[PDB]
Design an enzyme around this catalytic site. Structure first.
Site, PDB file in Angstrom:
ATOM      1  N   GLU A  49     -12.812  88.685  22.680  1.00 55.93           N
ATOM      2  CA  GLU A  49     -12.457  87.557  21.803  1.00 55.93           C
ATOM      3  C   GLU A  49     -11.222  87.496  21.816  1.00 55.93           C
ATOM      4  OE1 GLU A  49     -13.437  87.419  17.709  1.00 55.93           O
ATOM      5  OE2 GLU A  49     -14.630  85.771  18.018  1.00 55.93           O
ATOM      6  N   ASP A  60      -6.805  85.837   5.338  1.00 55.22           N
ATOM      7  CA  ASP A  60      -6.879  86.967   6.047  1.00 55.22           C
ATOM      8  C   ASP A  60      -6.455  88.194   5.370  1.00 55.22           C
ATOM      9  OD1 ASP A  60      -7.605  85.830   8.544  1.00 55.22           O
ATOM     10  OD2 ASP A  60      -5.590  85.311   9.215  1.00 55.22           O
ATOM     11  N   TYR A 175     -22.157  83.606  16.505  1.00 46.04           N
ATOM     12  CA  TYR A 175     -21.172  84.307  15.785  1.00 46.04           C
ATOM     13  C   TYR A 175     -21.895  84.700  14.331  1.00 46.04           C
ATOM     14  CZ  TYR A 175     -16.732  86.462  14.640  1.00 46.04           C
ATOM     15  OH  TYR A 175     -15.735  87.463  14.361  1.00 46.04           O
TER      16      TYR A 175
END
Ligand SMILES: [Cl-]
Ligand SMILES: [Cl-]
Ligand SMILES: [Cl-]
Ligand SMILES: [Cl-]
Ligand SMILES: [Cl-]
Ligand SMILES: [Cl-]
Ligand SMILES: [Cl-]
Ligand SMILES: [Cl-]
Ligand SMILES: [Cl-]
Ligand SMILES: [Cl-]
Ligand SMILES: [Cl-]
Ligand SMILES: [Cl-]
EC number: 4.2.1.20
Lengths: 258, 258
Positions: A49, A60, A175
């Site tokens: 990935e 994040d 996912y």
């Protein structure tokens, strides 16, 4: 090109789950990133990935945010990322390559041109991480038109309505991130609806989480930030960086035989 | 319309920091969301940060992700969000309204049409949370053309180069998140470069973090998820939900007098 289907069938031969590391392309430089990726593959990573550097600082953690900053500081552009992708594919013709990117990347050139470029360099799947399923149709259709697997995220509390959508829209792998439902329950339902094989991607920090995912029935696991953390912690010594990446991938693959 | 400038000057009169709650528009329904927002304002919120429902499941915590899911489950669309924004502005003509959204929202209609719609309903600022500073020019220019403040995020390890960019590009307020640097140091540098007043937005969970931000010199604090958590925990009782929101905003404003 059947790269994911062939991988999962061969992992079934080996009685193994997939281990799929995430790295940011160009972190901490173009050539170091290429060699990091070669090392992950040589150490046993089953697929890749790869992130086109983005910015999501409100959400994040410091690891992913700092990786994005390191790549931008090295002058990495989307153009250089696509050249790197092409080189990786040429050196490693069979490994599934999944791109992870954010929607603004497709603004400059347009959705069809982006997926055409992915097809040209040999990408297998694209996850546009910040597009709701309700808005995914133009991305899904452009992906299919260019022989790219569009990746859909199964969230931890997905009801059967959403599971049916995720199973039908996605290709390559699902996912999985797992009022949350039991991990085994999501896995069972996705199989019932003939979804692409599920890779558990939430909190895959170390061997224990890989083993847990495979024991629950998942086809494998995606390590979202653990590889980047090893990069950050070893920036001053590329040799030690690569050695720690090798031992990490080896330990994660050992857990995938559980 | 001077809404942020006037707010910060009046907060200086009061010797207070700003408290700015975040909520997702339409969570848990259109009318409940409107009344939640009225309650936050009546309880003392100084400005609003309002999210157009998005999807960022790889990075978001369960609180923000579940809020997005609740709003989509109520049938909320961007169109309804803009009508809600218009109503909020009409009921509350002076309060600064900051929109938080993600880049794919501007794909369907185009960047200029999005900012024109923001201007029409009376939004004061827009933060496109997932666009790197290197790609921000079309958003910044469209914002300025439509009398909208473009909001820039100051990350915790910003060097002076980046601080100069953030200070120059942004208007209204600087969205501060604080190899991290000391909080007071970032605040001092942003003031040195004449940045829009800094609102500390990282980890503003409870009164202690508001007080810490103001004591460090920040102009105030943005609570990214604490209000949403109170919504989620009180979904079954709107009356208790609104009462807990009032006591929370009151406690956060008490901390802003520190
Ligand atoms: Cl393929
Ligand atoms: Cl540079
Ligand atoms: Cl269900
Ligand atoms: Cl498939
Ligand atoms: Cl789990
Ligand atoms: Cl992770
Ligand atoms: Cl204004
Ligand atoms: Cl619906
Ligand atoms: Cl510096
Ligand atoms: Cl300003
Ligand atoms: Cl801090
Ligand atoms: Cl937060």
């Amino acid at each position: 090109m059947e790269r994911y289907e062939n991988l999962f069938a061969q992992l079934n031969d080996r009685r193994e789950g997939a281990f799929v590391p995430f790295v940011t392309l160009g972190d901490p430089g173009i050539e170091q990133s290429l060699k990091i990726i070669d090392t992950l593959i040589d150490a046993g990573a089953d697929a890749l990935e790869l992130g086109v550097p983005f910015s999501d600082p409100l959400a994040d953690g410091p690891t992913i945010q700092n990786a994005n900053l390191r790549a931008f500081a090295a002058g990495v552009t989307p153009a250089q990322c696509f050249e790197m992708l092409a080189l990786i594919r040429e050196k490693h013709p069979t490994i599934p390559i999944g791109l992870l990117m954010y929607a603004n990347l497709v603004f400059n050139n347009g959705i069809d041109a982006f997926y055409a470029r992915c097809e040209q360099v040999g990408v297998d799947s694209v996850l546009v991480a910040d597009v709701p399923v309700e808005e995914s149709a133009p991305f899904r259709q452009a992906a299919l038109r260019h022989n790219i697997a569009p990746i859909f995220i199964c969230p931890p509390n997905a009801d059967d309505d959403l599971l049916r959508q995720v199973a039908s829209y996605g290709r390559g792998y699902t996912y999985l991130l797992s009022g949350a439902l039991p991990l085994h329950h999501l896995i069972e339902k996705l199989k019932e609806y003939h979804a692409a094989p599920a890779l558990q991607g939430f909190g895959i920090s170390s061997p224990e989480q890989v083993s847990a995912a495979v024991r629950a029935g998942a086809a494998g696991a995606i390590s979202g930030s653990a590889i980047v953390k090893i990069i950050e912690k070893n920036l001053a010594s590329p040799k030690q960086m690569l050695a720690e990446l090798r031992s990490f991938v080896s330990a994660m693959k050992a857990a995938s035989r559980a």
